Amino acid sequence: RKDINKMYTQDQYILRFEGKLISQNKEDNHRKFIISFFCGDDTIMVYETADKNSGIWGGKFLERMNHNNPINNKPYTELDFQIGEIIQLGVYRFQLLRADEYTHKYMKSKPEVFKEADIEYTLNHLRKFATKYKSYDEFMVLLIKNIDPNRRGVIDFNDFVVGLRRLGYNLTYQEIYTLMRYFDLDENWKLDVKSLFVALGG
Amino acid sequence: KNRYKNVQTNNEYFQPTDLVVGKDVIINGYSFRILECDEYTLKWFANNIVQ
Amino acid sequence: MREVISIHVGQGGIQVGNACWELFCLEHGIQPDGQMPSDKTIGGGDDAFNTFFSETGAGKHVPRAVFLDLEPTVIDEVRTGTYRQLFHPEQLISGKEDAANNFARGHYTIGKEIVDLCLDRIRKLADNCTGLQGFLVFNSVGGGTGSGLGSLLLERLSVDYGKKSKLGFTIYPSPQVSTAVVEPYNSILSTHSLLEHTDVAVMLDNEAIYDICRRNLDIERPTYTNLNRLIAQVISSLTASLRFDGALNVDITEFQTNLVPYPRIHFMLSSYAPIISAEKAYHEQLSVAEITNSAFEPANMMAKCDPRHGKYMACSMMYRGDVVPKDVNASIATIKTKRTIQFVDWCPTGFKVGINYQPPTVVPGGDLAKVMRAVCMISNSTAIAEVFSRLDHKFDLMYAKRAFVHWYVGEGMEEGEFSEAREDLAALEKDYEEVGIET
Amino acid sequence: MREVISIHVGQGGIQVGNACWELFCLEHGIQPDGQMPSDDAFNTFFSETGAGKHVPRAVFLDLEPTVIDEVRTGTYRQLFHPEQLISGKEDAANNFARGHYTIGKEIVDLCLDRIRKLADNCTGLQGFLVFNSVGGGTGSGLGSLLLERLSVDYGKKSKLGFTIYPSPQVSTAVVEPYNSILSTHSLLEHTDVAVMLDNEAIYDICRRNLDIERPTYTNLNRLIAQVISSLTASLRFDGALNVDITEFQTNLVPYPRIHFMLSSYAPIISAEKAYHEQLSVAEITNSAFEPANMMAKCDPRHGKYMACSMMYRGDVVPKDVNASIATIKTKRTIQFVDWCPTGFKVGINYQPPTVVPGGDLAKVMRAVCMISNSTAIAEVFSRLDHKFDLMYAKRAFVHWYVGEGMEEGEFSEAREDLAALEKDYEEVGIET
Amino acid sequence: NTTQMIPTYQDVKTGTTWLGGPTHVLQEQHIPGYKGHVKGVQAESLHGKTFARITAECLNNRYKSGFIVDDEERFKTNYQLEYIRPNLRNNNNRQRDDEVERLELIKAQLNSQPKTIEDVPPIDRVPVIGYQGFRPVYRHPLKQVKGPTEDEIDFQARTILELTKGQKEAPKEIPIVGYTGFQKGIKAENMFGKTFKDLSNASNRI
Amino acid sequence: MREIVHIQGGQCGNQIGAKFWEVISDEHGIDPTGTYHGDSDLQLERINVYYNEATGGRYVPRAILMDLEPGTMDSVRAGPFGQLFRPDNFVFGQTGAGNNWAKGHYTEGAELIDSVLDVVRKEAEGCDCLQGFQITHSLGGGTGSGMGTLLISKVREEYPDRIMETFSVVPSPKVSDTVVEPYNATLSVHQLVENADECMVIDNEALYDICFRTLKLTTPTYGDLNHLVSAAMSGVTCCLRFPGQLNSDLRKLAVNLIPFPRLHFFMIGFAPLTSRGSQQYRALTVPELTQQMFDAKNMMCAADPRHGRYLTASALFRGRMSTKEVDEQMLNVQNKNSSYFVEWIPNNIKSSICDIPPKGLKMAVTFVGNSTAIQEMFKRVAEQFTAMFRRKAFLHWYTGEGMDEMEFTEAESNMNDLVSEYQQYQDATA
């Protein structure tokens, strides 16, 4: 058989991601890769982007095909594809860099499927972790003194992952991106702790 | 010299009482405002329209 | 690095060319505006859209086309409608006066002063490209403006460019249903010039779809809306293999090298499947095994011809999608065992097989149900002679009373020109008979 | 340290000459008042005053007060040197004789000194750009007389002239044939390089590409304006391959006599349609030689090709030049003359065209200007003679000229030259 | 009119019917082969749109009746109705919105430097040294300039800000290049040198 | 772009346009003040087809008005849409034609017929591209026919590359309004045939029959007759002025309706037309067309249309229709009267489609097919000429203005041959 209802109903959806390859050599560390995921029949695709004058032979790197994770031995479902996660294909390893604005709307559209997408579950995910501190406001107070050592009122992502992981809390990358992307007033990847704080407390 | 529709009254057929100088009237997409009346005309208002 | 450009001329030429883009445009994600969505800001992948278009440095895309017509009505309205933004603003050349169905007007009177602009346009249109496989021109034969300009353009394409393969999808008037009053005249004269310049020509007579629409689509009041579209799928199928991954690809130049037995005889007829009402399409699986058998059904011939009235020289049929190649060997096999269809004597095998994986997309509000498995065929059968015989006679009476001739002479055309046409036809009926006789 | 002095004579140069400065100024970065807004190479047309505004390197002349004064009151009143706009009072009224024999004699002196003053600022004086239309009585001469003295006043200085010749059929005045015949006589043996700018060829540019149904002499300016900015571009910013004024008179004039060349400019596509195409090198340069784009009303196909030099501006890469030129050669419709086996002079510039405000021209990343000198040019010359031939036959409109100082024999002498110039063209084009 | 309402956005995403879809669950149909009078097939001569699709328009009471058409209901070219974008599978160009903004902004800025109220440098008060001209003897030798009245400049600012992400809409919608229509008095008034595409803004704006 | 102008000689033509220019006014949506008050984009796209533009923004037709007497234009100009016309174009004669063809064709017009020629010429020159003319006149009137033809004569001498259309009214056998009708009903035909391209013959008599037998009203008036005829004009150019699957311009019909150079006369009748009350009971459909398009009572021709073999015809439908019912029915429309159709011209029924329907109806059609049935009129009219001429009755009038009987003798001679050559094709067989 071949899923009949699967093909006719959910055919149109197509997700696009940008990523970077990890391997043994320096050879192809800086060139970029664009990953296309057809959810109609769970077929993975590899496409190559080559900048002008770069000298690399632009074109197709892998044809759309179907292959699976050796460890869990279960075909690919929509769950594994997430921002920052690494998917294993063939004898390569790819990393997802950024999502397609078409995708996110599709990404955030279906909670209960991509839980990390649901905005509400994200903050609380961090909220439920605040039980260790005796005083709730203490958990409020310390945060400002941990994530932002300089208390500048604005922070950048590279420190935030280290800053948060500095305390010890465990957040999968797919949760981290969703929070910051919400508070970017001018859409330049600049957090507003106050807006985060105001939601956290006021 | 033929019947003309009256815009002012629900597209009705005109009546003698309509003509009132000092208040404008419109006929078939045109702007008419009278100035005066023939002194013969004044009598006719002066014998029947009175109520 | 592979492409094919479109030629449009004649009222029906413009009208038909209308449908091809929406089916083509929607396939690649190109909305009417040109920027694919306002949302998808990744792109730079699946390099195939060059097969029909070109890139503009940044922004939208341009269809590789030039629009021509001698009337302002249809062309002008196309400048205020839904697709106002796609076609190049200056590429839709327009005339000033109509041909008025007078063939002589379109070949020696009014078409002379407008062919230059297109021929000028074609030069660059080929210039910007790199891998031009061949030209495709759609022209309703039964059009005084469509024909006279239609016939000429094919003439210059032979000398200025030459060996490039040119394809033309003409639509002769229906065997009994007719629209104009002098269609037979603009039939043959349009028939002569293209005889020795067009490598490929396929039958698309209008009436055939009329039965095609009713029998399957179940349309009791079909209008010109649904006649063109089903053809559009015909255009898509033939060029579908040149812009998507395929197990055994077929090239446009690999089409006219396997369906024209002699340089002289260059006509063939086609037919498509499956057409079935979306409200009842799915209850039958046009079945993968029986899809091909649907190909040879006379009732589904897009041309009013009876393939059963002659032998088959060769079949050019293309599927689409994920049909297992093994089925192609089997299903096609059953045809040979069939006795209702017989081949010519000298041709052992006349089947060219092309398999593609991409499935045909569904139009919005159209008739065809979004199907799983389909297939289409392009064939050259001696029965093609059947139509010409009926076409020939229609002129015989007309010239007998030389009616309507007087205006033609007023266009400067040589009366002897008509003389050659009937001489031309003599071989047409004659040559087929010689080919039709077994050794 | 490159300089050039601009000399404007007659209204036609006045209107265009006024037009040309807007194109340059906005390409420099100087506001209309002429004061740098708190922002070297821009010296090419200017001389610093030490502190403050800048004086354009131009001088204006005329025998008519109306046209010149209009500049001296509008937006640019503070642009030029206040006194340099020398002006007379009596116009020749298209009477060529009036422009060089009774009135112009005295007022020429003022011009000679002013240029005499302007050059002193210049240290490496390169040449002169002269603007003047053919269809002008005073316009025909005043430029000539300055041409005669200047050729003997500045020695071997190489110079150029953007003449504007009359259309094959469309003409505003009625005595145009005379001055044109003499004007060539006057300008035949005094100039280095002069371009063909007959107006009628210019209009045809507007309709087909800019899609304008009614452009006046104004729109003719900016489109013509780009030509001036074209040739001189290489001298006044960087480039991967320079081409100077001095390196023109030694690359387009094989013989001392044949010196008439017709140029073209491109691309020219409005801002409301161009965004559909990438504006590629291959598609553009083929527009340069196209018969529909030559700016002089003559057929670039009727005659042989001798040598054509083209200058590019934009962010073009040279390889788009090397590949394209090979394509042009192999064509079987544009053919080169027998005696010039190679005739391409390729120029490349980096800065983009300066989009005019506020103007009609769209925004593009590449522009092309081609200088064509083809044997077919003779069509303009011969057609002029026939008009002159029929007219002079009846001694018409003659007495108005002798009384101003013209000897009857003057008209006869010229007619020899044009055919004499006519004789040269046939000889040069004959293969060995 | 069946297509644009049916397969509604609630039908495709996480729904039952697909793009084509067996669209008989949502509404009442009659599975082709059938005889009778559905009350809306023979009378109104609806074209194309295969019989199955015709039914849904029949009973659902959408229709359009009367021998006399309500002006608009007849004044459409069928070209438009057939080929109306892609509509319902899954959910125009902002062009000329910047054009207007790119249009007035040029107008305003040029109107923001007239040197209002004797703000010109000491020079330029009188004409250039070489002027000729009249220069009437009995007149105020200097020049007088009125200039915009404060609020006039501020008035343009509000419109400029309002247009950018404001209630104001795109002006008309205009053709491409060669439409040979009347264009609302391009000739009745000269409007000669105005960059033909820009004429439409000059044409329909009035 | 493919526009036409208007000219109308005498009273007859002037009245025809009265309800005509009104009709062209309402379809595009123009009020008596000429201001634009439309709703959709269509109603203004091709407004140049009958109107030129001037400063101020008011739209007007391009109509040439001329007549030999002041009585008539002093009546129409005041009526609805009466102010639209260009007062500059107004010129006219001062003595009147006097119901005599002789007086109005050699004495009066000759001195003044240049006047219209200038007014005729100028309006044609200023346009971008000129397509054709439509002239309405009467054969039973003095100035109408007389001055009517010569104006057609001169124009043909200068514009041989265009088409010319003239709607002529010949006197039906019953309702004859002039005793001297046969002569001007006689002389006119010669001149018209030798220069005319397309001719449509309409008889007032058949107009009365249609009114009673279709509209079933009580007292028809001249206004309504204008109501019926004026619409018929809308058949020809309604396709020519808006979109359509297969546009059918004048030359499209011409190449598709004129089988021979010397047969340029047609007979037409309009549908639908139903009594006011019965409008609801009838169910308009394509089937409702064929039964009434070819039906006898819809034929505005005095001659019975079923008394001959049809040669060719064209169809210009109006309203949203799928051609399928347009096409299939016609082929049925031919076989069912194959004995009614000539045999050597296969497929002699033409069809066309216009998206915009006539006002007030969801579907309407105009039918034009070349038929020999008209042969009754020429034969019936012909018999009238020799009966009066042989006696030379009223001959002093014509002989009193410089004419002879040779022109009259020539007029009768060519008439028989034309019909005689017209009736030959009726019996032609393959």
Ligand SMILES: Nc1nc2c(ncn2[C@@H]2O[C@H](COP(=O)(O)OP(=O)(O)OP(=O)(O)O)[C@@H](O)[C@H]2O)c(=O)[nH]1
């Ligand atoms: N398949 C198809 N055929 C059509 C269509 N419209 C018209 N035709 C056919 O085309 C024939 C006439 O040729 P056209 O191309 O429409 O007319 P033309 O080429 O513009 O010539 P002119 O009408 O004289 O200007 C008719 O007899 C129809 O059979 C259409 O929409 N689809």
Ligand SMILES: Nc1nc2c(ncn2[C@@H]2O[C@H](COP(=O)(O)OP(=O)(O)OP(=O)(O)O)[C@@H](O)[C@H]2O)c(=O)[nH]1
């Ligand atoms: N391209 C262009 N040509 C112009 C323009 N104005 C005038 N001409 C040309 O100049 C001719 C008119 O004579 P001009 O040379 O201008 O006269 P002038 O410069 O005032 O000198 P006089 O004739 O002595 O007054 C016309 O035939 C035009 O061809 C312009 O604005 N642009």
Ligand SMILES: Nc1nc2c(ncn2[C@@H]2O[C@H](COP(=O)(O)OP(=O)(O)O)[C@@H](O)[C@H]2O)c(=O)[nH]1
């Ligand atoms: N269509 C139409 N024809 C009319 C009307 N009244 C009269 N006629 C015809 O006009 C003819 C008279 O024309 P006439 O004025 O003598 O023409 P003239 O002498 O050239 O001006 C009569 O035979 C009538 O048949 C009308 O109201 N409508």
Ligand SMILES: [Mg+2]
């Ligand atoms: Mg046509």
Ligand SMILES: [Mg+2]
């Ligand atoms: Mg002058």
